[PDB]
Amino acid sequence: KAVIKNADMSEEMQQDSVECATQALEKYNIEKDIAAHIKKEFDKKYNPTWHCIVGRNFGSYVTHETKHFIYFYLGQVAILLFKSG
Amino acid sequence: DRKAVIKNADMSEEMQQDSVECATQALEKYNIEKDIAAHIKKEFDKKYNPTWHCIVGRNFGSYVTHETKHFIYFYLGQVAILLFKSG
Amino acid sequence: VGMHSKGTQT
Amino acid sequence: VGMHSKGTQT
């Protein structure tokens, strides 16, 4: 399911990551709401500032804190989450 | 057919004209969204201080945080560009 | 001031 | 402390 295509976080965190985007992807149907969910979670759990993109079609270019990055697929939806600021 | 529709924005009008101008260039030249994104993001870091972040996509929703006056969300034809500054 | 969260949806 | 760039595509 959770095909992690790239990651700079600790193994723990990638889980907490994958799991939460599952909750979020279960509970919500609008990408923004899923992203918003994950994002606000991580802010409250790992401190600000996190950013989250959830889409099926997107290219990105971003800058992140060491050990606070992850881009993965969950089914057919791509989920980019990362810290910076 | 590259027509620009700025849906949401918190930057200065001058800086959002560049966001568009830079993105137009990027769209014409490159074929990969990641490369258009990288170009815009690099051009913005250099011309406007780090640190910028860019998303170029056809299907995505985002939830992000940004510095006041450093945000824009817009369309160039059918494609959505998210550009903003954090950290 | 400073920081504002914002959400987008295509 | 420190920062790194990353690109992603679908």
From Swiss-Prot, chain B:
The keyword Disulfide bond does not apply. This is Dynein light chain 1, cytoplasmic. The keyword DNA damage applies. It is found in: Cytoplasm, Cytoskeleton, Microtubule organizing center, Centrosome; Chromosome; Cytoplasm, Cytoskeleton; Nucleus. Acts as one of several non-catalytic accessory components of the cytoplasmic dynein 1 complex that are thought to be involved in linking dynein to cargos and to adapter proteins that regulate dynein function. Cytoplasmic dynein 1 acts as a motor for the intracellular retrograde motility of vesicles and organelles along microtubules. May play a role in changing or maintaining the spatial distribution of cytoskeletal structures. In addition to its role in cytoskeleton and transport, acts as a protein-protein adapter, which inhibits and/or sequesters target proteins. Phosphorylation at Ser-86 promotes recruitment to DNA double-strand breaks (DSBs) by TP53BP1 and ability to inhibit MRE11. Phosphorylation at Ser-86 appears to control the dimer-monomer transition. According to PubMed:15193260, it is phosphorylated at Ser-86 by PAK1, however, according to PubMed:18650427, the DYNLL1 dimer is not accessible for PAK1 and the phosphorylation could not be demonstrated in vitro. PANTHER family: DYNEIN LIGHT CHAIN (PTHR11886), DYNEIN LIGHT CHAIN 1, CYTOPLASMIC (PTHR11886:SF91). Belongs to the dynein light chain family. GO terms for molecular function: deoxyribonuclease inhibitor activity; dynein intermediate chain binding; enzyme binding; enzyme inhibitor activity; identical protein binding; nitric-oxide synthase inhibitor activity; protein-containing complex binding; scaffold protein binding. Pfam families: Dynein_light (PF01221). InterPro entries: DLC_sf (IPR037177), Dynein_light_1/2_CS (IPR019763), Dynein_light_chain_typ-1/2 (IPR001372). Keywords: Acetylation, Activator, Apoptosis, Chromosome, Cytoplasm, Cytoskeleton, DNA damage, Dynein, Host-virus interaction, Isopeptide bond, Microtubule, Mitochondrion, Motor protein, Nucleus, Phosphoprotein, Transcription, Transcription regulation, Transport, Ubl conjugation. Homodimer. Monomer; the monomeric form is incapable of binding to target proteins. The cytoplasmic dynein 1 complex consists of two catalytic heavy chains (HCs) and a number of non-catalytic subunits presented by intermediate chains (ICs), light intermediate chains (LICs) and light chains (LCs); the composition seems to vary in respect to the IC, LIC and LC composition. The heavy chain homodimer serves as a scaffold for the probable homodimeric assembly of the respective non-catalytic subunits. The ICs and LICs bind directly to the HC dimer and the LCs assemble on the IC dimer. Residues 65-87 are annotated as: Interaction with ESR1. One of its GO terms (biological process) is motile cilium assembly. There is a cross-link at K41 (Glycyl lysine isopeptide (Lys-Gly) (interchain with G-Cter in SUMO2)). Changing S86A: Abolishes growth factor-mediated phosphorylation. Increases BCL2L11 protein level and promotes apoptosis. The modification Phosphoserine is found at S86. Ubiquitous. Expressed in testis. GO terms for cellular component: axon cytoplasm; centrosome; ciliary tip; cilium; cytoplasm; cytoplasmic dynein complex; cytoskeleton; cytosol.
